[model samples]
Target chain A: MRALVTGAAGFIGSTLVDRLLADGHSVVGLDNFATGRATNLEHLADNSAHVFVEADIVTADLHAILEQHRPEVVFHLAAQIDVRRSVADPQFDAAVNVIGTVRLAEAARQTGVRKIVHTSSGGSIYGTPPEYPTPETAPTDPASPYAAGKVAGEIYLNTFRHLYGLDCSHIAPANVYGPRQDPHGEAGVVAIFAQALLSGKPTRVFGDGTNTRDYVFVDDVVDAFVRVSADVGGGLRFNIGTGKETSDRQLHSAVAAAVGGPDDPEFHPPRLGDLKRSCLDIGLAERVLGWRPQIELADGVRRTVEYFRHK
Target chain B: MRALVTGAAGFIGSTLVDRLLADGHSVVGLDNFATGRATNLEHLADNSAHVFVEADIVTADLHAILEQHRPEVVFHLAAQIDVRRSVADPQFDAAVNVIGTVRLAEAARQTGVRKIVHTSSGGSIYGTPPEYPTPETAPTDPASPYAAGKVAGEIYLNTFRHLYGLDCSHIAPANVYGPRQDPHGEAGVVAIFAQALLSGKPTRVFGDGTNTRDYVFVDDVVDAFVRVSADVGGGLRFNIGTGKETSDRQLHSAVAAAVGGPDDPEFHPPRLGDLKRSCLDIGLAERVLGWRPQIELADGVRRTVEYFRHKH
Candidate 1:
């Protein structure tokens, strides 16, 4: 199979590229490296199965590229991912996330791409949802512009499916944390703790440490994306998470154990705004896509810390 | 009270401006004249109450304009309303309809505007709806990019209302027809029939003449917009249509009778793809906003024909 992956220089994207190449699929990787690091994909330098292109999805010539390569499917992950930035300047967020997704869908359909596996936010789209294990049917309560943009992206793509016979599906993953995850970003708590602890630096946990999140490994999320690229889950959003709510304190202890550092950490007052508990119901993915989190939190933490330690 | 109206030089927009001014409200009307004509608002050239700005909402200093005027409310009717054009170029449609609405909401919040009466499409948003006279709660099935963009606009504005307390209400009107409608466009079947029959240009009806639409008079829609501006229907979509379906053949005869022209029309092949039935349930608007379609279809056709006849 031939595939085009947007944001291919980033953590999950780069990982997905490696998996696709290993699975004997020809891949065309697109990235502008805005937040994605070049070092992440440096390992794929001599791999003929993967072709890399430096292009911003917001302004790139997507139609020509798709027409040239004519990939069977498109994995659209490039977006303005920062929630705070979206709140600060929503127009830029819409331009990248909402409009970018629409443009990609248009280009893909124009080139007769089979399907688009769109990226959505499980953690943000359903703002403090009523149900602990939120399903796809849960009412979307977007508290920020970023979430609104993601919802809008899904709407536009599904609309394209209705207008044209463009097949598309949405993968709404919970706080995805795994190897190649950036340690300095606002997200990726596991990576931040791993980087700090492995280097023998102090780690600080915000709030009373009871804040919980559903941290699914990146490999598991990538697998879901790959699974949905086939003929299924069209016009549907499948939540990808472990369905287990791990608190900040528990996650810190796990990462500390992985790094062989002291579990004791400095505690700070709760962040001004943070969700106390966030988790996802992955039953739909399991039943439909035959996929689930393959890596346990402790083992995933060890693997993630090992990457940072080697770096 | 002071108000701001985008697309102020458009058909429905100009009518809204007149309604607002007649109600003793000062208006800051803005239009880039892309598809909106300057002639629509030429009559208000010297009116002290109405200040017209030739500006595009897609790329305008909306925050500064809102701040300067300090409008208590903004009626955002500005958009790329062509469905076929939206299908052809969706990114542009989204830029003007989706991004444009978000920009307007952001600026309105910055200026502390009280509320925004945002526009949606009752006809297109519910793509081949499950029920005749579809209510706002009916699932939004946007088959065209234009309809998709309108839905996105509603979503972004509602999100703004949830986040920033920027009050917003949606007015989803059915096939809006009346005076000032552009007869050349795909919409405005009434206007096309009126102009053709009045000028003896030979009117034509497509698809066995059974294709139906909910023809809500522009004045009634404008009245709904005005009604929703006053602390009602926030974060809600009110269908501003008369829950009545008028077939194409029925509408043509009505328009012909009003024009005192031949009711006989050429029957062309059915359009490749046309909705057999389209109507809206205005129960929500009536219950929430105390609004209803005041003019009957026959009377509205008569009034519309009168305007076109005078022009001819």
Candidate 2:
């Protein structure tokens, strides 16, 4: 099958592009390099199955591109992932995340694209829910503009589905970390801690290092996107995360263990708006899409560390 | 109490402005006159209690305006209310309704406005629910972009209320008809019928004339806005309607009776995407805000006809 992946130069998107090419599927990858790195897609330069196009989702002539490529499915991964920037200038965030998604969906419908697998944030979209592993049935409480824009994007796309039969599914991922993960991007702790600890620099843990996150490997999240694209339903949101929680200290120790370095780290005050604990119930994805997290933190951390060692 | 009313030159906005002024509160009226008429606020040009300003919500420097006026309460009635245009160009609708609402909310939070009485659509937001008089609890199914934009506005405003302490209440009105309703605007059936019959033009009733709408009089709807401005709860939606269904044929005869013209209307095929029936439950408004429809449909029709007859 032919596919188009927006933000194709990002960590997960680049990985998905590699996997699709390896499977002999033709692919068109789009990126404006706003936060996406071209190095992520550099290894695919020789592959004829993959075509990389530099285009901004909010400003590019998307209708013409979609008309030309005419992919059967669209993996919408381009977004304003910076949460702090989102809070400062929410309309900017909305223009990119909300309106950009709308434009993409509109183009996809006009081009007869089969479905769009949307990216949603499982960690922040629930806004400190009562449960550890929040389910999809839980009412969304977007605590920030980024999360709210995501909710708005999902609303607009589903409304399109209702109006124009444009099918869509949302892959709500937890802290996805693996190779090619930018240290300054969304789900960056694994990359951040590893890069900092690798250079013999002392890592700082905030608020007694007790805050927990449900970190799923990047490949696992990419697999969720790949699975939902062919699934039998539309307008469904599936949470993609291992049903496990790792504390800030525990994760720091794991990274240290993988780095073969000292585990001792400095403590610091917690940042404002930092969630204490977050986890996702992946039962819906497991049952519906037949998916599970393949990589554990220990193994994934070693792989991630190894990638940074070379760079 | 001091107030600010957006869309002050609109039919309902002007009425709300007059009501607020009569209650001894000075108001700052804002409008761009895109859909609003200047005549709506012309009577108040000399009245010192109401100050009208021409400004677009999407582009205006609302921060300076709010700082200058320091209004305790804001009534947001300005919107892109055309449903067909919403279908044709949804992004434009979202820009005015979604982004515009966000801009207003950011300003409202900054200036310490106590509460915002938001306008919502009880007629279209539910999108043909199974219930006769749909309650607020019914999951919103926005079949059109206009309705979806209204839902988006509600979400953004409530999110602001959550993020900041800025309070808000949504007045989800049904078919509001009265003196200044534009013949080409939202809820213009009464005005359309009256103007056509008064001018000896043929009145149009689409479909079999059985499609029903819950017609709430404008002053009564304005009273809901006034009531909700002081209502206790924030982030709440109150459906403002009479909970009574009036069919198109019945409404036609009522308007003709008020006009003392022939009770005749040319029937036509139903418009596509038109809901077979629409009505709203206002029990929540009654219990929470002590709001109820004071004017009946027949009497309201008579009053509306009188206004249109008196107008040039």
Candidate 3:
């Protein structure tokens, strides 16, 4: 299937671009340089099967891109990735995440795009949920403006689907980490650990070194995005995670083992403004998209740390 | 300086006007008059404590009105209240409900308003729930654009409450019936039965009349709103309905008996998209707001019938 991917220069997105092209599918990938790095998509510049467009979701003439590229499905991964900035100015968050999403929906449906695969946050959308591995059916309790905007985006798109039969499926991924992830960026914990561990820099584990996240590899998450691009399960959220909790100690050890460095790390005082334990119940995605995580954390971290060393 | 109610000339809005006045609060009311009737607030023309303003919620300079009125608490009831139209044009519905609510939240918070009491639809928000007398905890399954907008409003307002210290409470009441309800309007079955039965026209009860709704009186619903007006239960939806389901046949009989008309009525096929059963588990309001419905259905129906008869 020919597809257009938003945020196509970022970690999971750039990986998905390569995978789609490798699967014998033509791709139109778009990204803005705001947070997306250039080197991530530089490999695809020489490839004819991939067309990378530099554009922002909020300000770009998305309709023109859609009409020219005319991809069947849209992988909407572009978003305001900063949770801190969202809390500082929620209106800006809503403008980019909510209003930007609304604009994309209008343009995509009008351009005759058959379906859009939206990206949702599994870690943030459900705020301190009751269950350990929260399912997509869990009540959405958005604690921040960023989380609320994600839920609103889903709501508006579902309403659009009800109105125009423009099919949509939201992929709510847990703490996503793998190759091409930013070590200096706030969104990536594993990338930071791997980069610090690789450079012989000191690493500090937060929250008694036991606070956990369900870290699904970037390649696995991209596979979910491609699989959920199908017509089935329209207007539903597919929780994409390994459904397994890995602690900070466990994660640090994996990164160190991947880099052939010391696994020992100094433990810092527990972080106050973080969830104690977060994971996603991945049954729905497995059942609907016929998808599951292929790459494990240790192997994925090795590739991530290796990428950080080179690029 | 006191309280402001949007959609202030409509059925429940006007009723709340009288209730607020009787509760010793000076009130400011605003309505677009699209579906709201002038007759509802005409009696308050001479009441010095009541101030009425006319403005469309959409495209209106809402910030200017809030800055002028300087109301401390705003009762946000202004909306595109038609469900059928919502189904036809969801974008239009969002413009009115979603974007309208967003504009209102921005204005109200900026105006230094202490709290805004929002209106939610218990009848519509929880579409065909798994449990009877659905509680506030039920997962919102919005079937119509109207329901989705209400949910969106709650979400946006709650986010505002999080950003600023401005408090908000959403009141989700079931089928509300009382005086001033439009007889010709959709979903006003009580008013339709009262007017037709009093005028000696043949009354039509849809289906075998077994379909049920949790009909709480308008005055009691207003009481829920005013009680929830306090700074309690912020960013929460209080289900305000008598937890008893009243069948359509039972409702028609009450209206007919109140009008002193014959109890017999013609039976017709139920309308498509009608829910077989709908009710709200109102215990949240009882415990949280210390509020409960005082008027029974039969008594409220009799008073409602007498209101139509006198208006004639």
Candidate 4:
């Protein structure tokens, strides 16, 4: 199968690209290198199965690109993923996330694409869930414009599915962290902690480190994306988390242990708008897509730390 | 109170403008006259309380305008309301309804506005509702991009409410019909039938005229908007509709009787994307805002027919 992966030079996207290429699928990766780095795709330079397109999803002529490539499936991972920036400048966030997704769906539909596996935020879209492991059926209370934009993306894509025969599924992942995760970004605290700890730098945790997140390895999230791309989970959103809550302190300890550093971390005041706890129920993904997280926290953290150490 | 009304040159919007003005509130009406007509505000030309601005909500500098006016409340009614057009060009619909509403909310928040009374579609948003009188709690199943845009508007507004305390309330109306409704537009079957029958233009009903709708009078909807504007129904959606489901045939008969014309009609193929039935449970509105539809269908139809008859 031939595939188009947006944000192909980003952490999870590049990982997905490698997996697709390893599986003998021809891949066209699109990225404007906004948050995505070109170095992430450098390893794919020698691979003939991969073709990289330098383009912005929000401003690019996606219709023409889709028409030109006419890929069977589109993995829409491009987004304005930062929650705080979304709060400060929501219209820009909506333009990139909501409008960009809409444009991509429109272009895909026009090109007769088989299906699009769109990215959604499992942690934020649920917005301080009533339950620890929030299911797909949980009511969406998007506290930020970023989350709202993601919800809007799902709605517009599903609407397109209803209007046209264009098939789509939403993958709501919880705190995806892995190798190639940019440590400098607002998110990817694991990557930040790993980089800082590996370099013998001080680590800081916010809010007494009690704040928890469901950190699914990026490889598992990519696997879920691949599974849902096969004409399954159409018009549905699947939670792609490990159904486990790892606190900030626990995660810091794991990353510290992986890098063979001290577990003690500096504590800071909780940032405004930071969710206290977030974990997702991955039962839907397990049942529907036959997927589960393969990497444990220690192993994944070690691998991520090793990657940054090599860099 | 000072207020800003988008789409203030449309039927329900213009009516809301009049109601606000009559209640002694100053109004700043914004319209690009896209589907809205200048004639709708012609009566307000001599009124000092009304200030009309020519602008498109989708493209306008809303932040600047909101800052200038500092409206205590905003009635955001501007939209690409046509469902079929939304089907053909959903991105445009979303641009106007979804993104435009977000922009307005962003502006309203920046200006420290008290609240925004946004519009939603009680008919389309429910998407062939499971119950007879669909309440606000009913899951929104938008069948068209138009309906999807309206739902998106409500979601974004509510998210803003949580994020910035920019208060908002959504009024979901079911097939609004009354005077000043453009008969030539795709919606408002009452106006279409009234104008056709009043002018002897040979009215037609699609799909055996059995497609039902909750035809709440425009005045009643405007009244709901007014009630919701005063720091009430925030972070909630009130169904501003009558619970009665009047079939298309029944609506046509009512219009024909009001116009004293032939009740017989031509039947056409059911349009694609047309819902089989739609009615809203206004119990939520009544319970929350102490509001109910005051004008009966017959009386509303009579009043609409008179407005068209006088024009013809």
Best by lDDT: 4
Best candidate according to DockQ: 4
10 residues in a row with least lDDT, candidate 1 chain A: A269-278
**Candidate 3, residues B143-233: lDDT per residue as tens digits?**
6667777887788788677666679999987889989999886668999999988888888878888989999999899988888788888
Better of 3 and 4 by lDDT: 4
Please identify model 1 stretches exceeding 4 Å from their true place: A200-211, A260-276, B206-208, B264-276
lDDT per residue as tens, model 2, B1-312: 999999899989999999999999999999999889999988887999888889999889988999889889999999987777777777777778777787888788889899988888898888878697999988777767777778777777776776776899998988899899887543489999998889898888988999999999999999989888884757899898899999999999999999999988998887644566789998898888888899999999999999988987
Q: Can you write out model 4's per-residue Cα lDDT over B98-195, one digit (the tens) per residue?
A: 88998899999889899999999988887867788888888888878889889989989999998889899999898899999999976779999998
Runs in model 4 deviating more than 4 A are: A262-269
Worst 10 residues of 4 chain B by lDDT: B266-275
DockQ winner between 2 and 4, please give it.
Answer: 4
Docking class of predicted structure 1: medium
Task: Rank the models by DockQ, top first.
Answer: 4, 1, 2, 3
User: How large an RMSD does model 3 have?
Assistant: 5.7
When summed lDDT is taken over every stretch of 10 residues in candidate 2 chain A, the lowest stretch is A269-278
lDDT of each: 0.88, 0.85, 0.83, 0.89
Docking class of 4: medium
Sort order, lDDT high to low? 4, 1, 2, 3
What residue runs in model 3 are displaced by over 4 Å at the alpha carbon? A1-117, A131-138, A153-169, A177-216, A229-236, A242-311, B46-48, B52-70, B106-113, B160-165, B192-210, B247-274
